Design a protein around this ligand. Structure first.
Ligand SMILES: C[C@@H]1CCCN1CCOc1ccc([C@@H]2c3ccc(O)cc3CC3(CC3)N2C(=O)c2ccccc2)cc1
Ligand SMILES: C[C@@H]1CCCN1CCOc1ccc([C@@H]2c3ccc(O)cc3CC3(CC3)N2C(=O)c2ccccc2)cc1
Lengths: 219, 230
């Protein structure tokens, strides 16, 4: 928690996970599940480098990941897809349009929510520095109300860093707090998407505690 | 055109009343009748919710279709935050009505009910830990009304989404103003703004899980109902 805002941004940029590649309608769902399964491991490695995360007990680290993992997968998809209007870039070799998501019942409703988030990011010209902060807030915030001071300390630190990023970009104080608010209000829609996404996945899948624990690779 | 103080005044004057459950000293409380009472209460609350929304500055500038879509997306979240607010001064309890005050042991009678009850209690506890102020509450409720449905909506649509973000920006200015007036540094102002807006994610999560629970008993106010009221 002693890092400067610049050191925080640099830490988070450095921790970014790699973009993974993909392995008919039937094959489409299998490719998407296999991709998500392989990304999860890299998400766990990313989480361990979010300043302050590894200060939590392993139990609490797992609970946070249980709560945030689908939200983190979607905000990364939305980020990857931001410069591909009307499409979603699941992988460099798996670019899909909404028309491909019509074969499965209830798939296109989420496809559209994801596209709308990408359009919102495009409208706001979301910067990579702001995205890695938002993704860190999702990790620390999503499970906090379902288990504390340390989590809120880290969250306050990320808030400071987001403000610092905006003042550094020349925003007035008013524009700083309006942009902060706008970014955080997107997190409510990402929670909504994650909830509707879970319902859809169950309509056809949660990582177990032991699985997340093992990937954390305790020492 | 409103100032921050003017925005606070409008939102405070728009606040709906606290409604009651039925009184009958000959009728002891029973858990078999609890869901009927809560449904009756929520249905009455929805009517006042419509007339509150029409007084949230900028809300009636939208088309009726988009007013309905926003209410469709936010109505349960608004009932839930109202419940949480009413319960804030009553640890361990949910104050559905002043004469309908329940603890979690009374929320175990129905499957999946205690989980949502546990979440509502935790949000109430969070409101206390922050010493959430009434002026801040009505701003948060307004943000839910304008924000919940805006990512799920043509040239008219672009104009109304622009309007909605302009009203949301003014409520942000108002929240900050209230925090500066209370004597917080800017660091504390930014940090508190963030803490408040992050609670809205949990309120959305609760709304989703509560929808699932409502459909599990077998629910939504129809478009024509909401339109007629609006
Ligand atoms: C990972 C867990 C652990 C235990 C087993 N689980 C495996 C199943 O969960 C998952 C998780 C995610 C997806 C994909 C996937 C993959 C990669 C990505 O970056 C993002 C996504 C996004 C996502 C929406 C959520 N999705 C879909 O298909 C989808 C997209 C659009 C509309 C409807 C649906 C598939 C399956
Ligand atoms: C309004 C719709 C439109 C068309 C018909 N109505 C349909 C009924 O939907 C409703 C809506 C809300 C509730 C209550 C109710 C009432 C008042 C309140 O202030 C708040 C709440 C909170 C709420 C959780 C959401 N709830 C429950 O019972 C509950 C609480 C705890 C755990 C599990 C369940 C009942 C029924």
């Amino acid at each position: 928690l002693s890092l400067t805002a610049d050191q925080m941004v640099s830490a988070l940029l450095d921790a970014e996970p790699p973009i993974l590649y993909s392995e008919s309608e039937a094959s489409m769902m299998g490719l998407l599940t296999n991709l998500a399964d392989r990304e999860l491991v890299h998400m766990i490695n990313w989480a361990k480098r979010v300043p302050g995360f590894v200060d939590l007990t392993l139990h609490d680290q797992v609970h946070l990941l249980e709560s945030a993992w689908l939200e983190i997968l979607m905000i990364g998809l939305v980020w990857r897809s931001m410069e591909h209007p009307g499409k979603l870039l699941f992988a460099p070799n798996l670019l899909l349009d909404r028309n491909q998501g019509k074969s499965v019942e209830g798939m296109v409703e989420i496809f559209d929510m994801l596209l709308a988030t990408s359009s919102r990011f495009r409208m706001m010209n979301l910067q990579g520095e702001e995205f890695v902060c938002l993704k860190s807030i999702i990790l620390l915030n999503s499970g906090v109300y379902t288990f504390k001071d340390h989590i809120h300390r880290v969250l306050d630190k990320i808030t400071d860093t987001l403000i610092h990023l905006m003042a550094k970009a020349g925003l007035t104080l008013q524009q700083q707090h309006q942009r902060l608010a706008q970014l955080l209000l997107i997190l409510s829609h990402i929670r909504h998407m994650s909830n509707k996404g879970m319902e859809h996945l169950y309509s056809m899948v949660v990582p177990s505690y032991d699985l997340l624990l093992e990937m954390l690779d305790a020492h």
